[PDB]
Amino acid sequence: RGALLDQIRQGIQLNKT
Amino acid sequence: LKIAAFNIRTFGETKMSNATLASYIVRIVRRYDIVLIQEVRDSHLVAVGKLLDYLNQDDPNTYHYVVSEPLGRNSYKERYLFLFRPNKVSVLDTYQYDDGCESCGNDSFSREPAVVKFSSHSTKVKEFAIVALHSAPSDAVAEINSLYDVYLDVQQKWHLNDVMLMGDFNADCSYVTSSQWSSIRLRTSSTFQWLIPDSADTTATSTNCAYDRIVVAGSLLQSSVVPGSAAPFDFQAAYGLSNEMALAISDHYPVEVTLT
Amino acid sequence: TTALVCDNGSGLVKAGFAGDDAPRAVFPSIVGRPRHQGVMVGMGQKDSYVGDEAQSKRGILTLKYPIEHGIITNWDDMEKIWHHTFYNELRVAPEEHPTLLTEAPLNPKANREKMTQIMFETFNVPAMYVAIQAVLSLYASGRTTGIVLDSGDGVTHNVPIYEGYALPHAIMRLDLAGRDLTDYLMKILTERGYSFVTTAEREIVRDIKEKLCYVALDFENEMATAASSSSLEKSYELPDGQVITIGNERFRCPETLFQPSFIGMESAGIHETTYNSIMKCDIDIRKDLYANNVMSGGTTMYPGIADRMQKEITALAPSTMKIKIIAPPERKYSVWIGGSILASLSTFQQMWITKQEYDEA
Ligand SMILES: Nc1ncnc2c1ncn2[C@@H]1O[C@H](COP(=O)(O)OP(=O)(O)OP(=O)(O)O)[C@@H](O)[C@H]1O
Ligand SMILES: *[C@@H]1O[C@H](CO)[C@@H](O[C@@H]2O[C@H](CO)[C@@H](O)[C@H](O)[C@H]2NC(C)=O)[C@H](O)[C@H]1NC(C)=O
Ligand SMILES: [Ca+2]
Ligand SMILES: [Ca+2]
Ligand SMILES: [Mg+2]
């Protein structure tokens, strides 16, 4: 839960579709 | 079995929303077991759905349909619509003429013919095909000539000799003159019988032109035609209309024929 | 082992692959069944059309909208839409893909269970999850506390979220969205003297809405400016070639969001619902909500909407409150994007419900 919200805040790099 | 081809000028939402015009168009259509309608200008199929609602308001299967995507060389597009009484005939197969590539039909025809194979137990012909064409006026000779190649394509595909080719071929007047008939294989080949003669007037306008035609190939189909039955249907005379009301319906008469 | 993200709305399905930055497929949430018997040339008899083809062949069909105000209300139709999504749009075998689906705020639990039941029993997915739309929009913006305004085609909600927890008691639902706005734009253009009779003509209005409309910062002043000068007029060229020019309809249309009385509704406008939603929340978190008002959904795309929301909330909030509206350029796809992100995070992977688990439940 805490770990998840941490990752959400940090962001992910999404690819061109 | 009464069959017709009818070019209904810019058949669409506005025409079908007019209760008087709808009424006459429904009366015309109900004369026929199979009728081909051309100049369908109906972007979302609303006018076609409306006609079918009228036709099928008392029996949901009075008429079944075969309809194309919008066709045309350029951005001006039209559909072919067939309406048929399923207690009279069944559709076995359909296709749009291709010339062997995705957009090759447009190499020879502005509106690639729609081709429908029917099964018909009430006539001497048991299976036959109808090829629809509404030709481009400025390319009439070439397009009617190319219908020869459509007939050959039907032959190779369906192994069928019995084929009726019909619609507003623009086959007269400034678009096909007398000298030009000899260059049209559909006319010069003795495989074909032309049922609406060059003398016939098929326009609701004051021109005297045999634009709309019904051609038959196949010895069985030819044998099924009732002699003297092929003619334009002059709905202005039939319904005692003024010329103005008549022109509000269409600028063409249906051409019709009966098979037995 | 690439997950699917399917975001089903009242008007559009947005569907795609987890990890991508945009849905691969966006299409109308519509199913149509032929009203009469027959075929398209070269095709067999179809029992139904879904999406774009349903719209473009609508005149011979009976259309159904199986998602109403964000909620699935017709399950046979919804199955058709999901069938069409997997096989026709994305071209996948659903049995090969964990699938993340989205749902509306306040979706009944029985509704989420029916979704889950179809995905497993009907589509045989190996795994799935259902996330709340607004929470995904917030995630998409890199945050875990804030209040979402999500406005789509059928429904508008305000959703306050505290550390990832959407607060159901504070959720506001407003049944006014993109569809109502298109219908109202058509009405007022008609009043001006234009005419939208044929299907093709009526279809254009939605495009005029999306291309020319905007939210005035000061509605009354913008009205006088429009009457005073032609400076706010804009032209729209019809498919045929005719150009037509519109003035005050450009901003009257979305002003309806702030004044629902324009379409005869007696409800609070979106700035009032945003405030009232924040005011249902513990005083101690309000500062965090005010400073993180995330806008999501197609109907939040109007130019000016964020500035006007900043203004109206400022007038309603304590005089010292720092107020910030976040409206990302991609917000018409924010829910889908948040889904794409969530389904790709490593900390999420234990959260999938598997086929095995569903069978043992
Ligand atoms: N640029 C734009 N400006 C204004 N409105 C737009 C724009 N782009 C899309 N819309 C509107 O957004 C609506 C669709 O957005 P969205 O996909 O978020 O809704 P949905 O999820 O189908 O519906 P809902 O959230 O109500 O269930 C349509 O009404 C469309 O006209
Ligand atoms: C249905 O079509 C008919 C025929 O075009 C329309 O009647 C004509 O239109 C106007 C009426 O304002 C006049 O020019 C004539 O009285 C009509 N011509 C004929 C041939 O009768 C009729 O108006 C249409 N109905 C609607 C409601 O549009
Ligand atoms: Ca004549
Ligand atoms: Ca939505
Ligand atoms: Mg003649």
Kindly give the pairing relationship between strand C325-326 and strand C293-296.
parallel
Chain B residues touching residue C43 (CB < 8 angstroms): 94
Q: Which residues contact C206 (CB under 8 A, 6 or more apart)?
A: C182
Query: Out of B134, B143, B252, B256, which one is annotated catalytic?
Result: B134
Chain B residues touching residue C42 (CB < 8 angstroms): 94-96
Q: Which ligand is nearest to the CA of B171?
A: 5
Nearest to C338 by CA among C279, C297, C307, C299: C297
Interface probe for C, chosen from B35, B37, B45, B81 (most Cβ of C below 10 Å), is B45
Name the amino acid, one letter, at C329.
P
Q: How far apart are CA C158 and CA C147, in angstroms?
A: 7
Task: Name which residue sits closest to atom 21 of ligand 2, judged by CA.
Answer: B245
As a whole number of Å, the end-to-end CA separation of chain B is 6
Q: What is the DSSP string of C115-135?
A: HHHIIIIIT--SEEEEEEHHH
Name the residue in chain B with its Cα closest to that of C35. B49
Q: How far apart are CA B153 and CA C117, in angstroms?
A: 51
Q: Is B69 a catalytic residue?
A: no
Residue C38 to residue B64, Cβ atoms within 8 A: yes
Look at the block and give the residue holding tokens 């804030």. C146
Q: What is the DSSP string of C57-95?
A: TGGGEEEE--EETTEE--HHHHHHHHHHIIIIII---GG
Q: Which residues contact C142 (CB under 8 A, 6 or more apart)?
A: A8, A9, A10, A11
Contact B64, B57 (CB under 8 A): no
Nearest to C57 by CA among C82, C80, C79, C32: C32
**To which H or E segment does residue C255 belong?**
helix C249-258
Q: How far apart are CA B168 and CA B184, in angstroms?
A: 16
**Two tokens, residue C111:** 């509704």
Q: How far apart are CA B209 and CA B51, in angstroms?
A: 28
Burial pattern B204-239, b for ≥16 Cβ within 10 A else e, equals beeeebbbbbbbbbbeebbebbeeeebbbbebbeee
The CATH number of domain C178-263 is 3.40.50.620: no
DSSP code at position C96: G
**Two tokens, residue B181:** 């008939």
Q: How far apart are CA C59 and CA C199, in angstroms?
A: 9
Say yes or no: CB of residue C23 within 6 Å of ligand 1. Answer: no
Q: Give the one of A4, A6, A17 whose C-beta lies nearest to C16's C-beta.
A: A17
Interchain CB contact of C346 with A (< 8 Å): yes
Q: What are the φ and ψ backbone dihedral angles of C206, each rounded to 5 degrees?
A: -60, -35
Q: Give the one of B61, B86, B96 whose C-beta lies nearest to C41's C-beta.
A: B96
Q: How far apart are CA C289 and CA C274, in angstroms?
A: 10
Q: Which domains does chain B have, with CATH numbers?
A: 1-260 (3.60.10.10)
Interchain CB contact of C224 with B (< 8 Å): no
Q: Which residues contact B137 (CB under 8 A, 6 or more apart)?
A: B170, B175
Determine whether C43 is exposed, middle or buried from the number of CB atoms within 10 Å of its CB (0-12, 13-18, 19+): exposed
In the CATH scheme, what is the code of domain C132-177+267-328? Answer: 3.30.420.40
Q: How far apart are CA B204 and CA B241, in angstroms?
A: 11
Say how many Å lie between the CA of residue B204 and the centre of ligand 3: 5
Residue C59 to residue B46, Cβ atoms within 8 A: yes
* Residues carrying CATH 3.90.640.10, chain C: 178-263
Q: What is the DSSP string of C159-225?
A: EEEETTEE-GGG-EEE---HHHHHHHHHHHHHHHT----SHHHHHHHHHHHHHH----SSHHHHHHH
Helix axes of C178-192 and C199-212: crossing angle, nearest 10 degrees: 110
Q: Is B78 a catalytic residue?
A: yes
Interchain CB contact of C162 with A (< 8 Å): no
Interchain CB contact of A13 with C (< 8 Å): no
Contact C217, C223 (CB under 8 A): no
Q: What is the DSSP string of chain B?
A: -EEEEEEEEEESHHHHTSHHHHHHHHHHHHT-SEEEEEEE--TTSHHHHHHHHHHTSSSTTS-EEEEPPPB-SSS--BEEEEEE-TTT-EEEEEEE--TTSTTTHHHH-SS--EEEEEE-TTSS-SEEEEEE----GGGHHHHHHHHHHHHHHHHHHH----EEEEEE---STTTS-GGGGGG-HHHHSTT-EESS-TT---BSSS-----EEEEEESHHHHHHB-TT--EE--HHHHTT--HHHHHHH-SB--EEEEB-
Determine whether B20 is exposed, middle or buried from the number of CB atoms within 10 Å of its CB (0-12, 13-18, 19+): exposed
In the CATH scheme, what is the code of domain C31-64? Answer: 2.30.36.70
Q: What are the φ and ψ backbone dihedral angles of B93, each rounded to 5 degrees?
A: -165, 160
Q: How far apart are CA C129 and CA C111, in angstroms?
A: 14
Say how many Å lie between the CA of residue B249 and the centre of ligand 2: 11
Q: Which residues contact C193 (CB under 8 A, 6 or more apart)?
A: none
CB atoms within 10 A of CB C71: 17
Chain A residues touching residue C143 (CB < 8 angstroms): 8-9
Say how many Å lie between the CA of residue C299 and the centre of ligand 1: 5
The distance of Cα B65 from the centroid of its chain, to the nearest Å, equals 14
**Two tokens, residue C143:** 């945050």
Look at the block and give the residue holding tokens 């979402």. C148
**Two tokens, residue B255:** 């051409």
Interchain CB contact of C35 with B (< 8 Å): yes
Q: Which residues contact C54 (CB under 8 A, 6 or more apart)?
A: C28, C30, C31, C32, C48, C61, C63
Chain A residues touching residue C347 (CB < 8 angstroms): 3-4, 6-7
**Two tokens, residue B26:** 């429904």
Q: Which CATH class is domain C2-30+67-130+333-361?
A: alpha beta
* Residues carrying CATH 3.30.420.40, chain C: 2-30+67-130+333-361, 132-177+267-328
| 3-state class (DSSP) for residue C245 | strand
